[PDB]
């Protein structure tokens, strides 16, 4: 046949399943992608005026402690030694971030030793006991005290969720957000970096195999009857939206979306750092990304007098809006397992597998998407293709 | 013969020359070392109570942009991904360091953009023009202004040199010590790390060759007549003190020394960071090192309740004191080139080469010592050994 496997969607999940089938099972894989480009939401492209690489669907920072995933992705791209660090803008001051000795010194006015800082946080947070916290506000205060909560958590959280924190579940904080040293590495994982030649080159290399065919600007639901007729035996891995597959027969799953406002400025350096969080309510956006600083190794290929920045705004997703984060209201949860059983019937009846961020109504870091694909490959698709 | 080459001193210079002769020319090398251990001033050892690795002759942070040196040293040890960062203690506050947007925000009270910070520094430093500066104090003020100079430079410099900055040459500052971003990586080089198994293992691996013999606790000047008699043709690479070789026939070269006060504390974490500079005159020491933080990857082999710290004090070196930094008074400089011509005569008359930090009255970073040895090997010793 012209293909042994159809993959719907060319994001990291689809690309991983496709590449494994192609290179390990020697199968022909047809990938069907609705957008004009490969790579799903990890896709990046140059800004036309400056040439600076910008992430189209949000800043994407790669990090993992999963060695298998790390070894895998390094077949398709090399990574820079970039370490993500974040600063937090509060009342006209940039604070070291996340919360640790640096922030604590800046915000309480003098140096606290590790042991002194531990003691300080015990005092500040003594007010509410964690077991007795009823909502997000209280749970936070129970961990770090009112001053820290009100300066760095309250308004930021309110902006992201479009909701008063008093009206959010206590279960949404599970650990102490405070470091008792000066380590401001944003991520805790063994491996971290950015693709040396950008995300688009990386994702593209995954699809670059003699056994893989890619059809861009193609909606699965418009071509499916035709494609499966050509080889009825070929299984489908579907990574598009789960509810849309079943025609919203159980109603629409709820998502948060993001609006990005991208400006080219006539300065070489807007904030001297990749990501500045904006913690005060007076700013509509949650944070500003300055993309040249994601790739300092490319400095002499960047304009010296211009820079690209992007402000991020959070709101609930209406029809047509890009789906980014699942909301997971209890209504959403019940709607989900109704769809799960639809999906499982569809797999046994139609050899159609559901995966990925959209296919399973889930937030997945990139290494999680890849891990999950590697697993579906190993525990399902290997059998389904003999 | 029992040896084809004698190397005096087992520091990085000597070890590099020895290893190259041994492995590249297949020569037998005898290394003569006065102390009880290998490795010279880069030597490190475990503290007996905690097991934590401590650098015996000062903190040693490896960094280079010389790829040849980097490739070379990676034959003998692997390096961690440690990146050195320093904090600066001033009036009870830990400042981000070196001077950059972080410090500037903390010290002037609010956030300055790159462009605003540039403007601020232009204003502050406008007082003295750099070309008109007569001493160290003025030259500094001409670059960064009086407030920054007085808080972070003046007393620190005074402690290190044991001298009022007004009484130091303007030539001792050559560039603007200010960063116009939030990057607080202490070093600017391509390659940086710490030896995974510590310095002692690394230096030891360099000497570990079938063609290399090492004699510890052996003073060159006590054994030389005997050793050269065994093979009069064998050249000597001498890395001991230059003036002591020629019996101080031109008087004693001047050095700064360092006193280290090393304490084991009954806490797991004294300052939450490897190096805290102490910028105020009220503290006798220039900085405190907390050595567990040089190797965070060894945390579950470190005591959880104990930690080793070391305070550093600077003063002029008296007889017997370890020589660390050359002083380079003009008296010292003239004394030096008198010795240089003694040395060159000694090479042509005695096949004795002078190299290394002591052999040439010089401060050398480790990658510079290695580079310099690689060069003496390539441009002198190859010929001198055929
Ligand atoms: C705002 C934001 C920011 C980040 C991140 C997510 C979000 C929402 N991520 C996570 C990362 O984006 C995620 O891991 C991957 O997008 C998952 O790839 P998927 O294959 O699961 O779906 P993904 O959404 O990427 O791809 C699915 C593809 O299917 C296509 N499609 C849908 N319906 C179709 C149809 N009917 N026919 C054909 N094609 C169809 C879509 O066009 C799309 O290309 C992240 N992770 C991380 O590790 N670090 C980070 O810093 C970030 N940053
Ligand atoms: C306080 C301080 C701190 C640092 C550093 C230096 C100093 C002074 N260094 C620099 C580093 O220490 C330096 O590069 C190496 O010590 C140079 O090695 P040498 O071989 O030149 O001399 P080195 O002094 O190391 O070795 C000479 C050897 O000869 C021996 N010897 C002397 N006379 C003898 C005799 N008569 N007979 C036999 N043996 C004799 C001595 O005992 C010694 O072992 C550093 N660099 C860097 O890159 N990063 C850092 O962070 C630091 N930190
Ligand atoms: O300054 C801050 C930052 C975060 N939060 C709290 O922490 C939650 C999560 O913070 P972020 O979403 O900003 O950060 P995450 O670490 O959870 O995730 C970040 O890293 C991910 C990579 O794994 C993706 O890039 C993602 O979009 C990006 O926000 C917020 O909703 C809020 O409740 C604060 O209160 N203040
Ligand atoms: O807080 C500070 C630090 C430095 N200085 C000025 O800068 C000079 C040099 O500073 P340091 O000696 O502290 O630092 P260096 O970067 O020059 O060298 C450091 O890094 C070297 C590695 O290459 C060695 O480890 C060395 O011992 C260690 O001090 C000082 O004399 C002083 O004039 C200040 O004014 N304030
Ligand atoms: Na509490
Ligand atoms: Na000036």
CATH of the domain at A365: 3.40.50.720
C-alpha span between A99 and A153 (Å, rounded): 11
- Do A182 and A203 lie in one domain? The reply is no
- Based on C-alpha coordinates, what's the Rg of chain B? 23
Q: Is B307 exposed, middle or buried (CB count within 10 Å of its CB: 0-12, 13-18, 19+)?
A: buried
Q: Which residues of A touch B183 (CB under 8 A)?
A: 272-273
C-alpha span between A85 and B59 (Å, rounded): 26
CA A314 → CA A157, A173, A241, A325, A328, distances in Å?
Answer: 10, 20, 21, 10, 16
CA torsion sign for B13, B15, B20, B22 is positive
Query: Helix, strand or coil for residue B49?
Result: coil
Neighbouring C-alpha atoms within 13 Å toward the C-beta of A17: 37
C-alpha span between A2 and A213 (Å, rounded): 9
Which of A260, A303, A272 has the alpha carbon at shortest distance from A51?
A303
- Do A181 and A282 lie in one domain? The reply is yes
What's the N-to-C CA distance of chain B in angstroms? 14
Beta strands in chain B (DSSP E): 5-8, 29-32, 44-46, 53-55, 62-64, 86-90, 93-97, 191-193, 212-215, 236-238, 255-265, 275-278, 287-290, 307-316, 325-326, 352-354
Distance from CA of A68 to the nearest CA of B (A): 20
Nearest CB to A111; choose among B83, B92, B270: B92
Q: How many residues does chain B have?
A: 386
Instruction: Count CB neighbours of B61 within 10 A.
Output: 20
C-alpha span between B190 and A78 (Å, rounded): 17
Q: Please give the torsion angle defined by the CA atoms of residues A327, A329, A334 and A339, in that order, rounded to the nearest 10 degrees.
A: -10
C-alpha span between B124 and B121 (Å, rounded): 5
C-alpha span between B124 and B182 (Å, rounded): 20
Burial readout B69-82 (b: 16 or more C-beta within 10 A, e: otherwise)? bbebbeebbebbeb
Active site residue B208: no
What's the N-to-C CA distance of chain A in angstroms? 14
The last residue of one of the domains, among B313, B328, B343, is B328
Range of the domain at A168: 84-186+255-328
Method: X-ray
Instruction: Count CB neighbours of A175 within 10 A.
Output: 6
- Do B191 and B227 lie in one domain? The reply is yes
Active site residue B287: yes
Distance from CA of B374 to the nearest CA of A (A): 28
Q: Please give the torsion angle defined by the CA atoms of residues A272, A277, A279 and A284, in that order, rounded to the nearest 10 degrees.
A: 100
| Resolution of this deposited model, Å | 2.5
For chain A, how many structural domains are there in total? Answer: 2
- Do B268 and B298 lie in one domain? The reply is yes
C-alpha span between B103 and B144 (Å, rounded): 13
As given in the structure block, the two tokens for residue A261 are 């406002």
- Do B297 and B335 lie in one domain? The reply is no
- Do A35 and A18 lie in one domain? The reply is yes
CA A279 → CA A88, A220, B66, B107, B110, distances in Å?
Answer: 7, 41, 42, 21, 15
C-alpha span between B69 and B193 (Å, rounded): 13
- Do B134 and B262 lie in one domain? The reply is yes
- Do A248 and A339 lie in one domain? The reply is yes
Q: How many residues does chain A have?
A: 386
- Do A310 and A202 lie in one domain? The reply is no
- Do B131 and B37 lie in one domain? The reply is no
C-alpha span between B104 and A35 (Å, rounded): 46
Q: Would you say A170 and A138 are in contact if contact means Cβ atoms under 8 Å apart?
A: yes
- Do A162 and A270 lie in one domain? The reply is yes
Instruction: Note which residues in 364-383 of chain B have CB less than 8 A from chain A.
Output: none
Break sites following residues in chain A (C–N > 2.5 A): none
- Do A100 and A177 lie in one domain? The reply is yes
The last residue of one of the domains, among B328, B352, B374, is B328
Nearest CB to A105; choose among B93, B111, B181: B93
Sheet arrangement for strand A29-32: A212-215, A29-32, A5-8, A236-238, A352-354
Query: Helix, strand or coil for residue B48?
Result: coil
């Amino acid at each position: 046949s012209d293909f042994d496997l159809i993959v719907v969607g060319s994001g990291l999940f689809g690309l991983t399943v496709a590449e494994r089938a192609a290179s390990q099972l020697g199968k022909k894989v047809l990938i069907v992608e609705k957008r004009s480009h490969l790579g799903g939401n990890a896709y990046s492209e140059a800004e036309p005026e400056t040439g600076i690489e910008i992430h189209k669907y949000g800043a994407h920072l790669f990090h993992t402690s999963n060695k298998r995933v790390w070894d895998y992705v390094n077949q398709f791209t090399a990574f820079t030694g970039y370490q993500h660090r974040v600063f937090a803008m509060h009342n006209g001051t940039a604070y070291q971030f996340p919360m640790g000795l640096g922030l604590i010194n800046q915000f309480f006015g003098r140096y606290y030793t590790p042991d002194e800082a531990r003691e300080l946080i015990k005092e500040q947070s003594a007010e509410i006991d964690s077991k007795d916290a009823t909502n997000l506000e209280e749970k936070a205060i129970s961990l770090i005290g009112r001053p820290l909560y009100e300066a760095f958590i309250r308004d930021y959280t309110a902006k992201q969720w479009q909701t008063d924190p008093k009206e959010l579940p206590a279960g949404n904080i599970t650990r102490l957000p405070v470091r008792y040293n000066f380590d401001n590495r944003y991520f805790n994982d063994t491996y971290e970096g950015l693709p040396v030649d950008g995300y688009a080159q990386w994702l593209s290399n995954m699809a670059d195999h003699e056994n893989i065919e890619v059809r861009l600007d193609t909606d699965w639901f418009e071509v499916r009857e035709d494609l499966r007729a050509q080889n009825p035996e070929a299984p489908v891995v579907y990574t598009g939206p789960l509810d849309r597959y079943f025609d919203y027969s159980e109603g629409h799953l709820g998502w948060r979306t993001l609006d990005f406002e991208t400006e080219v400025l006539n300065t070489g350096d807007f904030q001297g750092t990749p990501v500045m969080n904006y913690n005060d309510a007076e700013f509509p956006y949650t944070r500003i990304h300055e993309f040249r600083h994601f790739h300092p190794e490319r400095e002499d290929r960047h304009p010296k007098d211009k820079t690209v920045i992007m402000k991020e705004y959070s709101r609930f997703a209406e029809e047509g809006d890009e789906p980014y984060y699942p909301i997971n209201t209890p209504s959403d949860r019940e709607m989900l397992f109704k769809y799960r059983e639809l999906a499982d019937a569809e797999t046994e009846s139609g050899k159609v597998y559901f995966g990925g961020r959209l296919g399973t109504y889930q937030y997945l870091d990139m290494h999680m998407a890849i891990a999950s694909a590697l697993s579906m490959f190993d525990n399902k698709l290997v059998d389904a293709l003999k």
